[PDB]
Amino acid sequence: DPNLWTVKCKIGEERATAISLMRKFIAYQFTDTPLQIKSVVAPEHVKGYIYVEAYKQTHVKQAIEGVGNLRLGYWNQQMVPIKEMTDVLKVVKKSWVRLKRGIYKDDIAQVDYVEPSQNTISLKMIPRIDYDRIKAPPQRLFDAEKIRSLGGDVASDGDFLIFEGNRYSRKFLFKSFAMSAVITEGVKPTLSELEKFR
Amino acid sequence: FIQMSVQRIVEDAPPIDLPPRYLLKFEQIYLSKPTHWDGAPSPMMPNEARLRNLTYSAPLYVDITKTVIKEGEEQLQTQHQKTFIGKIPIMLRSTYCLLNGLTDRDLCELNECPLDPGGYFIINGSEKVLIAQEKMATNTVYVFAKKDSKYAYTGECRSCLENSSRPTSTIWVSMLARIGQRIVATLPYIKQEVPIIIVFRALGFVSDRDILEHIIYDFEDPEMMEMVKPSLDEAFVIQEQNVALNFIGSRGAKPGVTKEKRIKYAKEVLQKEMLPHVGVSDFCETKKAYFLGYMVHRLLLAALGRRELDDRDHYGNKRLDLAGPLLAFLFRGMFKNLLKEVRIYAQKFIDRGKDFNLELAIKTRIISDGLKYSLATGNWGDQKKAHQARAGVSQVLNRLTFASTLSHLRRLNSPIGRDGKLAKPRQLHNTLWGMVCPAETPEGHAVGLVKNLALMAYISVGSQPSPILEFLEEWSMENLEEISPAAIADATKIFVNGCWVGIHKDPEQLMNTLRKLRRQMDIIVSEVSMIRDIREREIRIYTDAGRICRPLLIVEKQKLLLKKRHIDQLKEREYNNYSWQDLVASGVVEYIDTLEEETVMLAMTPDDLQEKEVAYCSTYTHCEIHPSMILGVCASIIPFPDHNQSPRNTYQSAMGKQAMGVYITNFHVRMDTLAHVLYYPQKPLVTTRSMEYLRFRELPAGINSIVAIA
Amino acid sequence: LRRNEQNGAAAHVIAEDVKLLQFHVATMVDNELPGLPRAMQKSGRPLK
Amino acid sequence: ALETVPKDLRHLRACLLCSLVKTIDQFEYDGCDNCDAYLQMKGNREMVYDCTSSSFDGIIAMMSPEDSWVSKWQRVSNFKPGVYAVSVTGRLPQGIVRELKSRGVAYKSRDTAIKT
RNA sequence: UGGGUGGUGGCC
Ligand SMILES: [Zn+2]
Known about the structure:
This is part of a larger assembly, with chains A, B, C and D.
Chain B: H1 5-12, E1 21-22, E2 25-31, E3 35-36, E4 42-43, H2 46-51, E5 57-70, E6 74-89, H3 104-109, E7 121-123, E8 126-130, E9 133-136, E10 142-144, E11 151-156, E12 172-176, E13 183-186, E14 194-195, H4 196-202, H5 208-215, H6 222-226, H7 230-233, H8 241-249, H9 259-272, H10 285-304, E15 318-321, H11 323-350, H12 358-361, H13 364-377, E16 394-396, H14 402-409, E17 458-459, H15 466-474, E18 492-496, E19 499-504, H16 507-520, E20 529-533, E21 538-542, E22 548-554, H17 564-571, H18 580-585, E23 589-593, H19 594-597, E24 602-603, H20 606-609, E25 622-623, H21 646-655
Parallel strand pairs in B: 18-21, 24-25
Antiparallel strand pairs in B: 1-5, 2-5, 3-4, 5-6, 7-8, 8-16, 9-15, 10-11, 11-12, 12-13, 13-14, 17-22, 18-19, 20-21, 22-23, 22-25
Chain C: H1 4-7, H2 13-29, E1 40-41, E2 45-46
Chain D: E1 12-15, E2 21-23, H1 26-29, H2 33-39, H3 45-51, E3 52-53, E4 57-62, H4 69-73, E5 83-87, H5 94-102
Antiparallel strand pairs in D: 1-2, 1-3, 4-5
Residues 15, 17-18, 20, 32, 34-35 of chain D line the site of zinc ion.
The structure holds one RNA strand.
């Protein structure tokens, strides 16, 4: 059985390293200097190093030539224990969600309507904007007349208002966000959040 | 530094090539006068830069040729004219400063007094001065004796060929103290020492008589030849070249895992790291072996007592680094960084198949800000790795009194660390006669480690030794490679900048010819010093920078080459164009550095020490111009200093830089911090002739007062 | 570390993580360690 | 095989029949080679959506699939070279499962993930 | 906005 070793890789660029290695193997398999490595495994949450399965350090040192992702690991590689080969392949894991990016990060939001398109769903957000008074932010209720006085990119349709940032509002923001862009499990709004919305 | 060093550094950098590939070769640079801008390029006055907290710097333009070539015969050797690289700070009153060649009237109209010496940079509106640091001389063989370790003697020899990117790498050839007494070597980048004979056989000298021919130049003295037997019987296992290379490579910094790896690594480290100064050509064993043999021969000579040890305090063995070498040292790294950055920027585009624009590649910020930061802070190195670099190289100019300013512009520095109980580096060596002020020195924790030049002292700037080599080859010198080893003994060796180059048979005629040509100043410039030793048949020639030399008169037989005609022409030097340069041309005065001073006969004064009496020496070869010329700037204002106790002169030199006075003529314009000026300064009623050239009678500091001692 | 060994339990990254924790703890109460890197902040200076 | 190698890193999906990692378009443009003779999965986007789901964790690259223990443990030892997923959660449609059972294929999901 | 670093200098 070929052994498994750790090779230093750029943090976040491990996913394309396996693709590059596969392309290199395909390119060199018809040539006089093929890549003699058996397999390369990249875990889901392990960042900074990639597992490579081969027989001797010479084979990997020859094969990882020209790979800038493994430049730090080009010269020296560590030995992974034999008992960890099976452990390498182990992976573990009207509601409320919280956004992952943007200015609304880590905010309690309540689903308004579910679109059957399986792409985006509308949430109830607290407007985290300064009403175009500072920019040329804590959670607070939307003031329609304030932003109507401030002018700028603003549209009024009664209580349905449209303002800067492609945000749809009513009475409370009603904007659709990607299902992968929100976290549907692990929110649990508290009683203070309920009032705000053993 | 501006005219030569910058062009040499930019041209000797290897090109960068990176399937498509490119060249990007640089060529002749251009420079312009300092200019500030958005706005039209307008000349920047030094005074304006001083008030507005600007930086008196000049832009740098280089010519670049970009030749990118790919598969299918697609090469485009495009070139770009005058691409901006960075701003180089300019030193006042230089050739490239706006205050150059201007009349005193123009200077006054520009609010810059004509008395300002210049020689300082302006960084963010502060006047910075580059203190000259001293270092032990390079490319020379020195033998010392550390009697506190396993070695009884050590033949240290630095080596730097010419402005190498890697700093100087040392070579050690020592003797074990303890049979015993084994001669060994300490190669660079080798973690362990190695005996000498293995080193020689690694060069390929498998034969045994060749090694001893290289080391021993005369096979008639048994005590000399027997001393190699201890470290010759220690080496009879290794005979072939490959086994020697493997023996070396087994102890490398990163030893190979295969015999081929060890052999190639050791061969490369010998061909590149060891002794770059003798030559890094395709092959240099024929002279590297001779240089190692010379080191070993010197070590044996020291051991036998036929030649005394070298002195570290003697400034014939020291060099001074002025603004030139230090700026070049910074510029090497600040250009390597720029090359790395443009290479990275091109790489980030060629891999993705996209074309790169060279204008966006060049980061003027790195070079400009690196030079500015190093000048401003004095940490003489890169910002992130300054812990391995010197500090305090650049200090704020001390503009309190004129004498203080002058002294601060001519200040030396010993980089020996303070808080050291050693007194040898602090004592006043005999060699500091006419080169360094015997009196002026701080009395704090840095006593003896800070020095100031004498008044006549001059620092050599350096010159290429190619004409010297051409003249020697044209002359009757026999080159080193095509010489018979048996002929070494009955002849004199010839050195140039420490590089052994050939042998000569007649030393006296060669020395006379060199002296005559230098005095005529036709091929050998006046900066070159020729030293001939007689106890050991050697002739040494130096043309590098940093040597310290002073002018002296010439005595032919018992009279002076200076005659009434020269004085008469000098007295009319505002009518006649006859100047000091014309005096040097006629071979009347001759600059003499310390090593040449070692062998001259000096007369203190002609009208006294040259008359006919009971012959003391009667073989004078030079004469001092005036004995009082050996004092520094501050100690030359003391009246009757030869009548005072020695520490009093030092204290006066210390306190002569804290007396108030008119520190500069145009003091009402400068917005200086902590400016002191006296209402009614006066010139001394009793002066010395030396303070006429310090302009003391124009910017005095003090008042004549009726003093009663009661 | 306590959210990594909580779920991942990779049994290899845990060793490196506890090594880094040990190094940081040691540097917190002593910065001059033989054969160890200097704990420094991104300003060119080691920490006190 | 270059066609097995994904053309990008966008909306990758893992096969529930051989754990082969291909993009959503690759499952349509090129098709799953290890199951093309089984499902005829190439040629329609809807059945591509039904066959594979974008929810997966980890990527595995067998450079020598027939000389690796990871391939044996992931039940992809005899399968063709390509990028492989570690653990994928999902169930094949009942009609597809019955068709595969009638075509001499054993229903073995690649779900080795730990459910807390 | 304070901390840090370096340099110069005074008295022993
Ligand atoms: Zn499949």
